[PDB]
Amino acid sequence: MDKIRILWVDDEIDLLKPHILFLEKKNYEVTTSNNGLDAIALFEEENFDIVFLDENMPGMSGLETLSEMKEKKSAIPMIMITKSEEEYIMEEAIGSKIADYLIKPVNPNQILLSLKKNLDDSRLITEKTTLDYQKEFRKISMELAMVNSYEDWVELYKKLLFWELKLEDINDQAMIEILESQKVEANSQFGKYIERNYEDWFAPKADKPIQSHNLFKELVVPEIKKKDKPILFVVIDNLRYDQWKSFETVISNYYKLEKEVPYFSILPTATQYARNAIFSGLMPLDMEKQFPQYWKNDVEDGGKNLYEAEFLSAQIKRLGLNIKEDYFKITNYAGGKKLAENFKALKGNDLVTVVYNFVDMLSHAKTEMEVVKELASDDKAYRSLTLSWFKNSPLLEIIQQAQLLGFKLILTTDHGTINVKNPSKVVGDKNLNLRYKTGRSLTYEQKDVYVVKEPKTIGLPAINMSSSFIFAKNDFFLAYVNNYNHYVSYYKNTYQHGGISLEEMIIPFLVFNPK
Amino acid sequence: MDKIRILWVDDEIDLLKPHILFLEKKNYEVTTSNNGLDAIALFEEENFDIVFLDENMPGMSGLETLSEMKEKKSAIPMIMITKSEEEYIMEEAIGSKIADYLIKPVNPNQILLSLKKNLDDSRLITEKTTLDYQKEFRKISMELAMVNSYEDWVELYKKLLFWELKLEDINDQAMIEILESQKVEANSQFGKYIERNYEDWFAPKADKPIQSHNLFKELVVPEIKKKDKPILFVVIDNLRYDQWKSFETVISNYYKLEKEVPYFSILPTATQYARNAIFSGLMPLDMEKQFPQYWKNDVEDGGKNLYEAEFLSAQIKRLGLNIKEDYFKITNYAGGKKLAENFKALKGNDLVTVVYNFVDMLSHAKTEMEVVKELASDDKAYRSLTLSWFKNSPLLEIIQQAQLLGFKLILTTDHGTINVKNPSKVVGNLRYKTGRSLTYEQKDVYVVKEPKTIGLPAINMSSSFIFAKNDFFLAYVNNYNHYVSYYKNTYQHGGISLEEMIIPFLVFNPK
Numbered sequence A: 001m002d003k004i005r006i007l008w009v010d011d012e013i014d015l016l017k018p019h020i021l022f023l024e025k026k027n028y029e030v031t032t033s034n035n036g037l038d039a040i041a042l043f044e045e046e047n048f049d050i051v052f053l054d055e056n057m058p059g060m061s062g063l064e065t066l067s068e069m070k071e072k073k074s075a076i077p078m079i080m081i082t083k084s085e086e087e088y089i090m091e092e093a094i095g096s097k098i099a100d101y102l103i104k105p106v107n108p109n110q111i112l113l114s115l116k117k118n119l120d121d122s123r124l125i126t127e128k129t130t131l132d133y134q135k136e137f138r139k140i141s142m143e144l145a146m147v148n149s150y151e152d153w154v155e156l157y158k159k160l161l162f163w164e165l166k167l168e169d170i171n172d173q174a175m176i177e178i179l180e181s182q183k184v185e186a187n188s189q190f191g192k193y194i195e196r197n198y199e200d201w202f203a204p205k206a207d208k209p210i211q212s213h214n215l216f217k218e219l220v221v222p223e224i225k226k227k228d229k230p231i232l233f234v235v236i237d238n239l240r241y242d243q244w245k246s247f248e249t250v251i252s253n254y255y256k257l258e259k260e261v262p263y264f265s266i267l268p269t270a271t272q273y274a275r276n277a278i279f280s281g282l283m284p285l286d287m288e289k290q291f292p293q294y295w296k297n298d299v300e301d302g303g304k305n306l307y308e309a310e311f312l313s314a315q316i317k318r319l320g321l322n323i324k325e326d327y328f329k330i331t332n333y334a335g336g337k338k339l340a341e342n343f344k345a346l347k348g349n350d351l352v353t354v355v356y357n358f359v360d361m362l363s364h365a366k367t368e369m370e371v372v373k374e375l376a377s378d379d380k381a382y383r384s385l386t387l388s389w390f391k392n393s394p395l396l397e398i399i400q401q402a403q404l405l406g407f408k409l410i411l412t413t414d415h416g417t418i419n420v421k422n423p424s425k426v427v428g429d430k431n432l433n434l435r436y437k438t439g440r441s442l443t444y445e446q447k448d449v450y451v452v453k454e455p456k457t458i459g460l461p462a463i464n465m466s467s468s469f470i471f472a473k474n475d476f477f478l479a480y481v482n483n484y485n486h487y488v489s490y491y492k493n494t495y496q497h498g499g500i501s502l503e504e505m506i507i508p509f510l511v512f513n514p515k
Numbered sequence B: 001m002d003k004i005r006i007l008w009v010d011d012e013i014d015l016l017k018p019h020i021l022f023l024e025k026k027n028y029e030v031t032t033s034n035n036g037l038d039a040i041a042l043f044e045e046e047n048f049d050i051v052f053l054d055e056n057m058p059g060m061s062g063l064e065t066l067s068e069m070k071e072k073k074s075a076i077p078m079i080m081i082t083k084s085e086e087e088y089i090m091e092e093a094i095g096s097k098i099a100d101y102l103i104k105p106v107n108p109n110q111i112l113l114s115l116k117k118n119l120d121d122s123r124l125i126t127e128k129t130t131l132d133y134q135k136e137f138r139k140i141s142m143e144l145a146m147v148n149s150y151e152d153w154v155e156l157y158k159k160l161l162f163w164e165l166k167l168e169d170i171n172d173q174a175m176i177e178i179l180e181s182q183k184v185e186a187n188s189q190f191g192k193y194i195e196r197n198y199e200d201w202f203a204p205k206a207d208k209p210i211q212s213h214n215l216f217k218e219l220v221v222p223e224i225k226k227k228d229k230p231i232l233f234v235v236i237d238n239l240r241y242d243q244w245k246s247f248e249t250v251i252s253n254y255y256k257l258e259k260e261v262p263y264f265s266i267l268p269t270a271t272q273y274a275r276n277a278i279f280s281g282l283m284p285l286d287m288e289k290q291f292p293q294y295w296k297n298d299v300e301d302g303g304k305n306l307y308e309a310e311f312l313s314a315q316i317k318r319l320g321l322n323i324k325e326d327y328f329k330i331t332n333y334a335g336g337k338k339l340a341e342n343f344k345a346l347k348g349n350d351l352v353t354v355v356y357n358f359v360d361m362l363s364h365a366k367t368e369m370e371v372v373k374e375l376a377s378d379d380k381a382y383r384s385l386t387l388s389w390f391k392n393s394p395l396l397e398i399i400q401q402a403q404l405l406g407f408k409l410i411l412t413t414d415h416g417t418i419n420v421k422n423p424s425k426v427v428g429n430l431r432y433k434t435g436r437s438l439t440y441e442q443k444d445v446y447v448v449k450e451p452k453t454i455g456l457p458a459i460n461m462s463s464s465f466i467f468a469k470n471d472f473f474l475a476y477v478n479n480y481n482h483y484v485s486y487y488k489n490t491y492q493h494g495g496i497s498l499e500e501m502i503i504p505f506l507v508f509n510p511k
Ligand code: BEF
Pocket: A054, A055, A056, A057, A081, A082, A083, A084, A104
C-alpha cells in the first residue's frame, strides 16, 4: 500500500468531489464518510494516514469526531476543512491539536500543501538539510581558514551551531563526519587564536570581547538602570550555547527574547574563576587582593563559590546602585522547588540573582558515570537531556513565577563544556578532572595546552613565581600518569571544562521581556 | 498585553492593504518591506514575532530570504504567502522549516488562523485540554465503577494513560488532583479485584489474562512459527505502560505496530519472579521444582536472574522448536554499544533476545543519585527522561540495526513500578515480603498464607507472602520516622497496581 489514505468526513461530500478528483490525480486515496459516527468506525477498522473533518455537521461536530478519533489513534494528523471563520471555532480546533485548519472555499493546492506539510515534512527537511549542507560545507571549511578575529570566531561558531542542530537527525554518516571534522578543526584553530591573543586582551585599551569580569557592569547594569521592570538574573552553571539552543523554544512560551550577546568566559573556563568573576566584577587576582577573606585558591579546602552574594553586593555598592537585591544558589531539586514555591516573597526586589546548578556530568562513582554516559554519550544526547531537564526543572517554575510578576529575565552562564576525546599526561599536580591545572611543579605535553608561566598577566593568582597554569586545547583531557589507562577509559567521552574551545568559552547572554 | 509584531515581505505591498488593515483591526502590528534584503536588515535590528514572505520577488526570492533569516534567528516562525502553486516550491518551503504556506488569493481569516496556530497554540491546548477533562472526568469515574473484568481493567487503564499524558501540561491544580484521585481509586479497586481473583486464575480452565509464565508460549511462539522474518525480542526491565506511551512515536520511525497485547505480570511484580517466568515458561514454584540448580529464593546470596538464557533454551526445547537463538543481558552503556555495533553478526538467528536493564537502573537512581532526582522528580519528568534516554540509547541503535536486517520486533517488559506514598507497618524490596511470623495491616496488603496456591515457593507452612496494594510501602516499625522520610516518593515494584502489573507486549514489522 504505497498510496496515502485520506479519510474525509463532511455531510456534503457531493460538493467536495472536485477536490477529491484533484487529490486522486495526485495519487491520494480518499475514503469519504458523511457523518462523524460512521467515520469513527471506519477510523477504528482501517489505517488512514490522515483525516479531514468538516466542523458543522448535523450529528457529531468535527471537533467531537476529532476528540473520539484522537483517543483511539492520537498520532494520526487531523485537518479541519470548514466554512466556519469564527475565532472561537478556530481556538477550539487549535486547542484540540488540529494539525491544520483550512477555510472553505479552499484552493485544492492549499489542501495539497497541507498534506505535504503534515505527512512529508520530516523527509523533506532531512533531504533539504542534507543537500544544503552538501553545498555549504566547503564554504564553511574555507571561512574557518580565514577567521582572524574574536568576532569572526563568534560568527563561525554560530554557523557550526546552526548546522549541528540541523544535522542532528539526518542519517547520512558521511555528512555527519564532515561536520565533526569541521568542529575539530574549528577548535584547533580557535585554540591557537586564544593562545596567540589572550594575553594582549589584558593590556590597557585592548580590543577584547566582553568577559566574565566585565559581564555585570557592561550588560546587566544597563538593564537595571532602565528601571522599567524588576530583574530575575539567572546564571545556569556550565551551560553551552547548544544547550541554550535546545530549550530556546520552550522558554519562548513565557518570555520574548529582546537581546542576545555572545561573550567570552575568562580562563580557566571554570566556576571558581569565571563565575566568581561575574559576581565580583574583578579578575581572580583582584579578588585575591581586594577580598582575601572570600577568595580561595585551588590549594584551599572547601567550597570555591561560597561568597558570590557577598561579591555581588560589594560590586553593586562600588557601582553606586541602590537597589533591593537578593542572591540564591540552587544546588538541588529541593532547594529549587522551595524557591519556586516561595518566589512571590521577592515581588518587591529590584534584582533576584539565581545560580542554578545543572547535573554533575563528572561523577567519581562508576555507576553514576554509567548513567550519565547512557543519557549524554554524544552532543545530540546532551542536548536532548538538557531539554528534558529544562522542561521539568524547578528553574522553569521560577521563570514562570517571575513572568507572572512582570519580571524581566536575564539568562546567562559562566562557561560551557566539551566532550573530551584525547588524553594528555600531566605530572606533579597535587590537586579534580578539569581542562586546566595549576601548580609549581607541573610537567605536561606543551603542544596540547596553552601555558602561562606568568599568571598575574592574565588576572590569575600565583602562589609564587614558579606557579603556572596550563589550559587544555582541542578535545584534550588532562590525565594523571598513575592509573593512566583506567583514567583514560573512565573520562573519555565526558563533558569537561576549564580549557579552550568554542563550546567552553563563547557563551550566551540573553535578555527577555515577559509575554 | 503587548502587540504581536509581523514583518511582511512582498514586492506588491499595495495589493496587501486589505489584509494589513484586517490584521491591524485584530491588534497585530504589521511592518512591511518590499524586498528580502531590506527585510533581512529589519529582521536583524528588531524582534518580530513572525515573518510573512512572498516567494516571487525581484532580487532575493522568499526562499532565499527565509534561508538567511532562519540562520540569523531560527526560532522565529515564518509563513510563506505566495501565488505559487508549484509543488517543488511547496516542498522547498516545507523542507526549509516554514511554519505555514498560504496560497494567494488568501482569505484574511486563513492568515488569522495561521497566526493563532503558530503563536497561541500552547495556551489554547492547555485551556481546551482542561475543559475537555472537566467535561469527561465524571464519565471516567462511572466507567471505573462498571469495571467487572480484566479486559475492562485494561481499557480503563488505557483511558487513564491517555488523560495522564494530555494533562501533563495543564496548570489547574483542581483538575490535576481529580485525576490523581481517579488513579488512586483505580488502584484501590484494581487491588481488590486482584486480591479476589488471583488465586482462582490458577484453577483449570479459568478465564484469565496472559501472564508472565504464559507470555513466551502464547505470544512469542506464534510469531516464531510464521517463519517469515527473524525476531528481535526485547525485554526492557521495569517499563511502565506510560513510558511505552512516551516513546511510541519514536519507534514508529523504524517499526510499524502489528499487534499490542496488554498482559499481567505475576506476583510479586519483580524481576526474580516475573522475568524468570517469562524465560522459563513456568511459575517460580515450578522453577524451584524443575530447575533447583538455577532457581534462587530471596534468602540465597547473589544475582537472582543469572540463568535466563538457560531457562529460555530449555523452554524452547520443551516447546519442540528448532531455532538459532541467542540471549544478551545489557547492564551498561559499553555492553549496549558493543551489541549495537556488532548486531549484524546475528543476521542468521531466528531469535535474538535482549534484556536491557537501564530503565530499572533509572527508577532506583531517582532516589539515590542527585542527577536523576533532579531529572525524574515526578511522573511527567520520569517519562520525559525516559524518552530522552530512548531516543539516544544503544537500545534504539540495536533496534535500527534490526530494522535494516528485516527483523521483526517484539518489545515487552517484566513489570512496571509505582511512586509509593503511604507507609504500612510490618515486622518480620518494599512492595512484597515473605517470611514466617509477619505483622501487617491486612487492609493494606494481599495476604497469601499458602504460597504454593499461586505458584510461589515456601520455606515452611508458616511462611507466607504479602503484597502491597495501592501506593503503600511496607515500613519497619523500628526507625519508622526515618524509613518514611527516606522511602516516600520513591519508585518501588513487587506489589499490585496498574502501573506494576498491566504491561505492554508489542509486535512490529520493519518499515
Ligand atoms: F459545514 Be462546514 F464546517 F464546511
